[PDB]
Amino acid sequence: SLRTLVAGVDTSTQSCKVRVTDAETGELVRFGQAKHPNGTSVDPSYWWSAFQEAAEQAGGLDDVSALAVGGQQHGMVILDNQGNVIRDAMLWNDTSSAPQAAALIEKLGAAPAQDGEPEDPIARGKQRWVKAVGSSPVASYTLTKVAWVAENEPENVKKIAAICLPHDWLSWRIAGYGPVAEGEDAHLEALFTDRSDASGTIYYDAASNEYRRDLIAMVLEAAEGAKAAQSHAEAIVLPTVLGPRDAAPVKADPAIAGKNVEGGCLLAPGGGDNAMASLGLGMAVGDVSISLGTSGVAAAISENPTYDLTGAVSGFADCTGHYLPLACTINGSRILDAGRAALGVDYDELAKLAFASKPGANGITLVPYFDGERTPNRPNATATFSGMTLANTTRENLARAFVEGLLCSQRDCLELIRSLGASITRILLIGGGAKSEAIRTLAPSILGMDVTRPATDEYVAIGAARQAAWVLSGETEPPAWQLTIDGVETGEPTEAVYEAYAKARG
Numbered sequence: 001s002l003r004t005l006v007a008g009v010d011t012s013t014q015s016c017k018v019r020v021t022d023a024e025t026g027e028l029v030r031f032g033q034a035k036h037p038n039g040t041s042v043d044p045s046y047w048w049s050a051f052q053e054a055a056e057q058a059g060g061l062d063d064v065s066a067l068a069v070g071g072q073q074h075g076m077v078i079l080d081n082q083g084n085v086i087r088d089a090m091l092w093n094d095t096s097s098a099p100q101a102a103a104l105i106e107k108l109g110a111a112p113a114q115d116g117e118p119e120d121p122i123a124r125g126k127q128r129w130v131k132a133v134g135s136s137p138v139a140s141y142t143l144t145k146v147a148w149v150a151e152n153e154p155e156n157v158k159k160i161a162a163i164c165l166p167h168d169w170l171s172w173r174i175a176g177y178g179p180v181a182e183g184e185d186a187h188l189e190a191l192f193t194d195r196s197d198a199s200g201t202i203y204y205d206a207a208s209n210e211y212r213r214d215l216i217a218m219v220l221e222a223a224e225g226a227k228a229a230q231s232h233a234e235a236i237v238l239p240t241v242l243g244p245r246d247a248a249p250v251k252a253d254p255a256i257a258g259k260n261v262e263g264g265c266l267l268a269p270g271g272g273d274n275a276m277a278s279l280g281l282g283m284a285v286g287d288v289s290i291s292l293g294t295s296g297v298a299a300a301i302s303e304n305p306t307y308d309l310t311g312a313v314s315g316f317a318d319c320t321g322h323y324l325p326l327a328c329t330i331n332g333s334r335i336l337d338a339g340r341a342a343l344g345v346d347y348d349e350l351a352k353l354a355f356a357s358k359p360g361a362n363g364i365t366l367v368p369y370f371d372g373e374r375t376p377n378r379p380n381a382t383a384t385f386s387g388m389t390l391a392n393t394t395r396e397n398l399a400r401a402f403v404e405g406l407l408c409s410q411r412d413c414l415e416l417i418r419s420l421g422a423s424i425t426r427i428l429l430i431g432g433g434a435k436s437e438a439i440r441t442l443a444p445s446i447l448g449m450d451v452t453r454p455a456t457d458e459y460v461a462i463g464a465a466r467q468a469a470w471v472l473s474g475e476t477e478p479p480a481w482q483l484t485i486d487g488v489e490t491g492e493p494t495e496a497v498y499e500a501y502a503k504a505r506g
């Protein structure tokens with residue numbers, strides 16, 4: 001206890017991780033982890049139980065001075081007057097609320113075009129959402145879940161006394177709050193959040209630090225009538241949005257953390273997983289990370305708010321008081337799976353093939369919108385091979401086109417983010433795709449820069465610990481922790497590859 005410890009909690013869809021860490025160095029001291037049930041909806045009771053089991057495995061938190069929770073984004077947790085969870089949390093990957101996301105767009109776009117606005121009501125609705133709160137509705141977003149509940153479960157929507165996100169709710173439970181008996185104080189107002197998670201609700205505007213309670217009323221109207229919906233949306237407790245390095249007004253309950261340290265365990269604001277990982281990776285303004293799993297996520301840190309009027313790039317906030325333009329791609333590594341099926345080869349086979357080719361694949365371009373794309377915003381799109389010729393239509397060139405297509409899409413994302421006014425001056429490559437020799441080899445060439453490969457690690461848990469250490473220290477800058485790098489990929493830029501891709505995708 002002479003040594004100052006913090007704890008970074010990572011409550012993700014799949015599990016809870018607890019990383020007890022050295023406040024000064026970021027060094028791992030203890031670790032623990034527990035599983036969540038599968039499903040795109042879930043009883044938060046399982047998140048509490050997983051946290052408890054994870055923390056116990058990590059040797060408890062009695063010696064911990066500050067704690068932060070990084071959480072899966074968007075998940076809707078609704079509480080009644082008594083602090084009870086009303087119905088299952090609906091998560092980022094629930095698609096139940098898809099109709100509501102569509103309807104929200106039509107509803108905001110309905111009013112006639114104003115000076116400069118698109119004539120198409122859909123394009124116009126998308127643009128109005130982006131300007132209002134940073135992002136155009138998709139099923140992931142919290143507001144769409146609340147909408148769905150109003151439409152499908154009116155008795156439940158009318159009981160809502162508070163709405164919060166997974167990291168918010170876990171933090172509140174850690175502070176020792178929870179369900180109370182009738183006529184007891186639930187302390188719902190003790191709820192707090194940060195800018196990064198709140199920016200994922202589409203009822204919060206980070207630029208102005210304002211909850212848009214009118215957008216909540218808008219979805220409650222279906223169950224309650226207009227004025228009643230207005231009254232409800234005003235009455236609902238929403239978490240206090242804390243600054244990036246503010247301690248919460250409440251500390252951890254001593255039975256949970258800090259009983260053996262001076263001042264107990266303070267609570268840092270916490271945050272959404274993408275932004276927390278970025279903090280953990282030590283990312284600052286100008287950095288982008290590409291997380292390449294079967295699908296992709298390109299997230300850059302932006303000094304100023306970012307507005308993709310198209311509704312492809314999300315306008316989230318990061319965990320340093322700044323901005324997190326976030327570009328999801330449906331097609332990441334899965335493109336390479338397509339390649340294997342198409343050519344009847346395995347991974348190495350595909351790579352050997354592709355390297356046998358040349359940059360540009362002798363003219364063949366793949367626009368890999370298998371099953372559409374999130375970025376650019378083209379839901380009903382399909383993938384397209386172009387530039388084919390008798391001479392060039394071969395397994396080698398096709399192989400190379402599959403790889404170049406994967407990378408070109410990610411570049412396309414970087415260019416779109418740049419177009420929103422956010423400079424990108426360094427690239428980090430993480431996720432499973434990062435171990436792919438072909439992706440790893442061709443990335444610098446087609447992305448157009450060095451590609452840094454941070455060592456695989458618990459970036460969310462590390463980011464949460466870094467934020468708790470930041471708050472605990474009271475200093476203006478976050479803890480300068482050592483970052484481990486696996487390697488840096490360098491390669492001469494080949495602009496013609498992406499230039500051909502851009503033509504093809506249109």
Ligand SMILES: [Mg+2]
Nearest residue numbers: 189190191240
């Ligand atoms: Mg509060």
